[PDB]
Amino acid sequence: YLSIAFPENTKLDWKPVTKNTRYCPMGGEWFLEPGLQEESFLSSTPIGATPSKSDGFLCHAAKWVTTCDFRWYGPKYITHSIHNIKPTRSDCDTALASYKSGTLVSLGFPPESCGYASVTDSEFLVIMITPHHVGVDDYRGHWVDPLFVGGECDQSYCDTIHNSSVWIPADQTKKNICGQSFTPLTVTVAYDKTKEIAAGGIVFKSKYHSHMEGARTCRLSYCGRNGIKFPNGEWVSLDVKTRIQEKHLLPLFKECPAGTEVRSTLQSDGAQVLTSEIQRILDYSLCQNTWDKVERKEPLSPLDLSYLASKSPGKGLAYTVINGTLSFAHTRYVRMWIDGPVLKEPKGKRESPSGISSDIWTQWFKYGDMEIGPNGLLKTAGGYKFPWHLIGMGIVDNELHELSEANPLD
C-alpha cells in the first residue's frame, strides 16, 4: 500500500557532482526521453456521487368516490370509498408540475350526485406526490430501489410494486441514468515511438492521474459510456473513435472482470488539490533549500538528500554521499511498492502491490557508522529506512480505498 519512486537498477554508475545544476523538483520532465511519443485525447472523469441525481417522486393515484344510493324509498344513503389505481404518465406529469409549483391540492371527496331508483356515483381522481429518493447502478445505467418491479428500472416513469404508485425521477432529461458527476479532462498517452502501440507499452497521465500503467488498465463501461479503469481503480472516458498512433485506442484494452467497480477521482477533491499544491511548493522549496546547503558547503543529511529524489517515475538523477562527496547518477525512476517506511531487507514489489519482492538496491556506500544509498536511503541496524515523504499511499493504487471512500451521515 506504500509506494515510492525509486531507481530501477540496484546499482548505478556514480560520478561526483561538479556543475551544481539544480533539477527541482526531480522528474522525467527535465530529461528528453527519445523513443517516447505523447498524444492526448479529450476525456471525462467522475468527481463524486451527487445523490440529487437520483431524487424522485412517488406518484400515487386513487379515485375518491362519493356514491349516492336512492332505491324504492328511505333516507339518502351516501357512502365514501377510495380506489387505488395506477396513474398514467400524463397524470403523474401534471400532478408533479402542480406539486413543484405548489398547485397540487387534496380536494377530498366529490359532492353528492343523487338520483332516484338508481345508485350512481361521482368520482375525483386524486394524485399524491411523495418525494422518494432511490439509488443508481452507475455500471448498468438504471435506477435501483426495493420499491421497483424487479428492484430496478431504467425509464422516466418506473413501475413500483404497489398498484397505486409509480416513480418519477425529479429530472426527466432523457439521458443516461447516473448518480455521478463528471469533469472534462485532457488525458495524455505516452508510448514508445518506434514499437507497435499496445496496452502494455502505454502510460496514461492527466492532471489527476500520475503515471498510470496501461498494462494494468482495463476497459469498462461507466455511466453509459466507454472508458478505462486505471490500476488505481479510477476511471476516465474513452470512445471507440479516439485514435493513438493512427489506431483505435480503446480496443487495445481488455474488458474489465465482471463486477469491477470504479472510484471517484480522488485528486479532483478540493482537500486533495490543497494538499497537492502545498506539497508541490514544499517539494520545490525543500529541494532548492538542500541545494542551498550544498552551495554554502554545508554538510548534507540523508533527509536533505531525499529532498532531491524524484517522487514520480521517469528518467532522472539520483544523489548520494560517497566518502563525504556529493555524487549523482543517471537513472530511470520507477514505481515500486515497499512493505513499510522501515524494512528488514532492501527489497520491494516492482510490478504491483501484490507482486513479487525483489532486490531494489544493493550498492551501499560508507556513510559514517552506517551505509547509505540513493537519495538518503539508510542501511542501519534497525533496518532500511526511507524518509516518510518519499512514500505515498492511497493515490496511485486502490490499496487504501476504505480510507478515502465517502459515506453519508445520519
Add this chain to the structure above:
Amino acid sequence: YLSIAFPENTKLDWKPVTKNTRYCPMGGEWFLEPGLQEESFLSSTPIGATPSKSDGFLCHAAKWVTTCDFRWYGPKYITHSIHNIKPTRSDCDTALASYKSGTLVSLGFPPESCGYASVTDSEFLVIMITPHHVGVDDYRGHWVDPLFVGGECDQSYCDTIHNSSVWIPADQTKKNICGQSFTPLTVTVAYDKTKEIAAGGIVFKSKYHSHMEGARTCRLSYCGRNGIKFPNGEWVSLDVKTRIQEKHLLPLFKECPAGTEVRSTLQSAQVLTSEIQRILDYSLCQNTWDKVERKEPLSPLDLSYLASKSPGKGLAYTVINGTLSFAHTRYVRMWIDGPVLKEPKGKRESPSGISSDIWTQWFKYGDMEIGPNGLLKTAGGYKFPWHLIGMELHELSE
C-alpha cells in the same frame, strides 16, 4: 518511527454534534533545527489530576402551541406548532428538580381551545432536562465545551450557542485545583549547544505540549508552586534548583505581565497564521466542515482533517450509528510503526520505547469499525488516515 498526536485515552465520552460550531484546531508543527541539544527536566502539571469530564444538564424551553382556527365557516382547522424559547432560571430549577425526582413529563400538545370568528391558541410551557457532559479547564477548573458561548463557563447557569438552551453543572463545587497532587511530567528543552543558553534560544516540548517558544515563555507562580508559563497559556512547575547546560533554568525568563492568567481552553490569536502547514491544516478542517454543512458524505480522511495534529487539549471526532460525534480529549505525542498496523498499539514514551494499546472503543462503520479521527479497524489491519502523520534522528546527521 512515525510521530503522531493521538488522544491519550483508548476510549472517550462521545456526544453528538448537530450544533455546528466549526471548531478547527491549530495546525501541526514545523521543522526544528537538527543540530539542537536536548536536555529534559522533571516537572509537574494539573493535567491528569483535574477531572477531564463534568456532568450537567441542558435545560431547554419550548412552548407547545395548539392553534384553533374558526373563521366564517368550514371545518375546524387545528394546527400544532412548537416555539423554542429561552428558559428562566426558575423554569430550569423547577424542571431540574422534577427531573431528579422523576416528576418531569412532557405534556405533549395542549387540548384544542376553539372559538368562533377568532383564531385563538392554547400553549404548554414544556421544559426539558437532558444530561449533558462537558470538558474541564485543567488549570482553572472552568467548564470547557463548544456548547458554551465563548467556549467556556464558570457559573451556576451557563449560556449556550443554542439561544434556547441553558447548561447547568451537576456539581457546582468546581473542585480545588491547587490542593491536588500534580501529575509528574517530563519537559524536554531544546537549545543550540554552541551558544550560551538563553530564553530566546529555547524550545520546550512534552508529551502534552507541542513546541513552545522560550522567547515567549515567562516565569509565573501558580498554586504556590514556582513555574513557567508557555505561550499557549499552560503552565509547568519549575524551581530554581533545576540546571540546564550547567546553569539555572528558571531565571532565564522574565516575570509574567501584571495579571497573567494561566488557562487551558480549546483555543488559548485573531489574524490568520502565516505558517504554511497551519494554513493547510486549517483549510482542510474547514473543507471538512464545508462538507458537513452541505450534508455531503464523509470519508475517514475528511474526518481526520478535524483532528489536532500536535499535542494539546482538543476534540476528537468519530461516527456513531451514522451520527457525527465528538469528544473532549488531550492529544499526546505518540509514535506509530506505519499507517497500517496489525494491533491498535503505539509508543507513548519514546520511538525506541514499547507499544501499548492506544484505542479500544470501536464503533460499527459499515462492514468496518471506526475509531477517533478516521482511524479504521478493518480485516486488513488498523488504518490511520495519512493526514494524521503529516510531515528519526538518523535522517538528520552530518
